[PDB]
Design a protein around this ligand. Sequence first.
Ligand SMILES: Cc1cc2nc3c(=O)[nH]c(=O)nc-3n(C[C@H](O)[C@H](O)[C@H](O)COP(=O)(O)O)c2cc1C
Ligand SMILES: Cc1cc2nc3c(=O)[nH]c(=O)nc-3n(C[C@H](O)[C@H](O)[C@H](O)COP(=O)(O)O)c2cc1C
Ligand SMILES: O=C(O)[C@@H]1CC=CC2=Nc3ccccc3N[C@H]21
Lengths: 207, 202
Amino acid sequence: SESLTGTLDAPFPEYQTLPADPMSVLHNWLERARRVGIREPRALALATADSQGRPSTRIVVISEISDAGVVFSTHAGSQKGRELLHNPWASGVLYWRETSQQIILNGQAVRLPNAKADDAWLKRPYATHPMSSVSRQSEELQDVQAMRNAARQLAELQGPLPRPEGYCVFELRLESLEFWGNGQERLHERLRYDRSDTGWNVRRLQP
Amino acid sequence: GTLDAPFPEYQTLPADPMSVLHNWLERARRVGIREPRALALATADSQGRPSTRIVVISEISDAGVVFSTHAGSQKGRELLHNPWASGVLYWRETSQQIILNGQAVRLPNAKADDAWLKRPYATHPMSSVSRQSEELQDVQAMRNAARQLAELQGPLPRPEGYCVFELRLESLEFWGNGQERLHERLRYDRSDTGWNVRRLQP
Ligand SMILES: Cc1cc2nc3c(=O)[nH]c(=O)nc-3n(C[C@H](O)[C@H](O)[C@H](O)COP(=O)(O)O)c2cc1C
Ligand SMILES: Cc1cc2nc3c(=O)[nH]c(=O)nc-3n(C[C@H](O)[C@H](O)[C@H](O)COP(=O)(O)O)c2cc1C
Ligand SMILES: O=C(O)[C@@H]1CC=CC2=Nc3ccccc3N[C@H]21
């Protein structure tokens, strides 16, 4: 049995019109996702790779769309952080079950300045600050209750804490994108962009 | 996170992560998670640059998980030269992730024949005419060619490039939302004799 469950109309005029500027398509799709109530449309399955080219994956949230790509925050000492600092190339996929749409985002992640990290940190609900402050993301957790107790002590403040060392913001500066829609008669609609010396090259891909 | 999401394994540390995987997937099916087997699968090219896309896990095997694709696709070409891959399952309803890391191996043609025959026959026409991920020069021509094949009573022959991969796991992580933002992370790594297990900081 085919696994697709999407039933919401998902207009894809861009597959016909081939807009020159793919970030407009990204904005169009994300705005529509917000308006129709897609659940967690910005949950990005982000892939990085280690020193030997072995991929790793996890979900991160896209916090902003920038001129050059998409932005997310994480811990520098995490697996993804360590991998990106050595090999900036990454790829992430958005998949929206309700509309049977995928967006694939490929590019190089760049760590943004601390001033930007400071701002992103302050924009998080302060209830998130204690655990993010005590946790060394992705290192082994030796004592669960100890971590719980330490966070609870910091939570007493009931206000913002200093940005932890290692809390950082990456901009994934895009070099290619794909927009995927279910299409008609299983001719899935794949619109592929690749950065060129000036602007972008645009192609349709076979499903 | 709107549905119940028990994670007793975070407390008990079961020795066999494949048991945990089977149990999580069965639970997902029972509670009615939407498309639980939609795997965001990452591969990488010869420069170490990742690429991603969704594929569906067709079966859970002794060594890992299985999916089908076209050998000439981007993921197929990448796996042919670099077998290492990683995939993530994310279930919004229970705020759970499963991360699967290992090496993908192409299975024999008899296995591919069986997988092909198990697909709904209505999928056979487009899968036969399409060279997945190659540039599409003429949309209507592809549509018309598939329409010609759709008139047949299936099944059609398996197209040469239609293949099955087994992702043989070397590590797994089970992630749950936990309490007080202490997200619960259970990480397994293959050893010479079995599996090592640990908890990770959120
Ligand atoms: C819905 C969801 C969103 C998440 N968003 C982020 C995020 O924006 N940044 C982050 O560092 N981790 C986020 N996480 C946790 C990551 O998936 C992951 O566990 C953590 O970043 C460690 O990844 P790593 O060990 O591969 O580096 C999120 C998890 C879920 C379930
Ligand atoms: C929900 C969903 C499930 C999919 N499952 C598969 C699959 O099992 N096998 C496959 O080859 N493509 C599958 N696709 C299409 C892929 O996402 C992708 O477009 C195609 O495999 C080409 O990927 P590539 O160019 O990166 O190799 C699926 C797409 C969606 C939206
Ligand atoms: O659940 C399905 O059939 C998938 C849905 C969308 C696209 C697919 N492409 C495939 C290509 C080759 C083999 C299996 C696929 N699965 C479907």
